[PDB]
């Protein structure tokens, strides 16, 4: 098996909280920690960690004979594509710096940087629209037929998150004027909101998913005592993040939402893995190429795993699609019979690897889970999906109206 091609779909790195609203301040008596960068901006530490990942992959790709040990990679050998958010553009710059330092590798973004990128947001940009009847039904089925059903299984994790927050002493909890229950699910009833370009949950679910991610972010960023020192063992970490992981299982991994949102990415990956005459398609980037790096969001990876049926969990990582988490796709050729095979994987730093700023390397690698396409009918011994089967899964998952 000769390794021929590699498409890495990565999440951005450790970033500042995206939002810092007055609801977040009102659910806890304690002050939220400041960050070194503006909201939603990648932090230097996040870049370095992403850089480590860039360095490990370089080594590993050398080892597989895909890249050259010494000096910068050949022209066109590496391609970086990144969404317009600073965090994603910086994450692309950070990866390059680690994969091949001091080489001038361009990070290719959408020209108008203040517009969404259709390749990362085909719904918010007009390419296609979710169907309300089918998307709501399907989300409600996944919830177990109702949102009440869903949030009923969440009371344990809300109890733990209420504790970490010190919710009873919170400005909101005093709803309780001088007759109303303090309970977090009862103060913020969750509500499924589906439209043509967006599906969301308003209430404790959306906010629990956000604050647990902030906790997790504080951990990877090295900040002293995340959760105000109220998170103390991995059990508590896994119980909190259950809320984040669970709000992505429902919204992002529903296929009637995942197939649509992810079709431009499916079409990009598809075109980067197929042996084909050289082609400068999107972002001025010629495909196919050796290593293609795509810097996106947790939603892009969730959508891909829902549409492709790649279900995974990251031992040592409470966040299922953590900062810098990578869905790696590789085309290997079998020399015996000259056939193309596809292999998928989740590469990642464990939360302790982020909080120790551990330097990755061949001998200090990151977590890595090997995935298999549920639907693939043509596997090798290694459990790789044939290029034909993988192509056929993609064509079945993709939603043509949502292609760029
Ligand atoms: K406001």
Author numbering: 6 to 183, 185 to 410
Give the exact sentences the study uses for this entry.
The AppA-HET variant, which produces almost equal amounts of InsP5 [4/6-OH] and InsP5 [1/3-OH], shows the greatest reshaping of the active site. The structure reveals the glutamate residue to be found as the t rotamer (χ1 = 168°) pointing away from the substrate analogue, instead forming a salt bridge with H250 and making only weak interactions with the sulfates bound in pockets A and B. Furthermore, there is no low energy (or otherwise) rotamer described for glutamate which can leave its carboxyl group suitably positioned for to directly participate in catalysis. In fact, E304 positions its carboxylic group at the back of pocket B forming a salt bridge with His250 and makes only weak interactions with the sulfates bound in pockets A and B. A change in polarity also occurs in this pocket because of the distal position of the carboxylic acid group of E304. The sum of these changes presumably produces an active site able to accommodate multiple binding modes. However, the electron density for the InsS6 molecule bound to the active site of the AppA-HET variant was less well-defined. Consequently, the sulfomonoester groups at positions 1D-3 and 1D-6 of the inositol ring of InsS6 were simultaneously modelled in the primary specificity pocket adjacent to His17 to model static disorder in the binding of the inhibitor. The inhibitor molecules have refined occupancy ratios 0.47:0.53 (S3:S6) suggesting little intrinsic preference between the two orientations of binding. In addition, in the structure solved for the AppA-HET variant an inhibitor molecule was also found at the entrance of the active site, just above the inhibitor molecule occupying the catalytic site, and interacting with K24.
AppA, the Escherichia coli periplasmic phytase of clade 2 of the histidine phosphatase (HP2) family, has been well-characterized and successfully engineered for use as an animal feed supplement. The E. Coli periplasmic phytase, AppA, is a 1D-6-phytase (EC 3.1.3.2) and initial hydrolysis preferentially liberates the phosphate at the 1D-6-position on the inositol ring. HP2Ps catalyse the hydrolysis of phytate via an obligatory phosphohistidine intermediate. The catalytic proton donor is found in a second, short, conserved motif with sequence HD positioned such that the aspartic acid residue functions as the consensus proton donor in the catalytic mechanism.
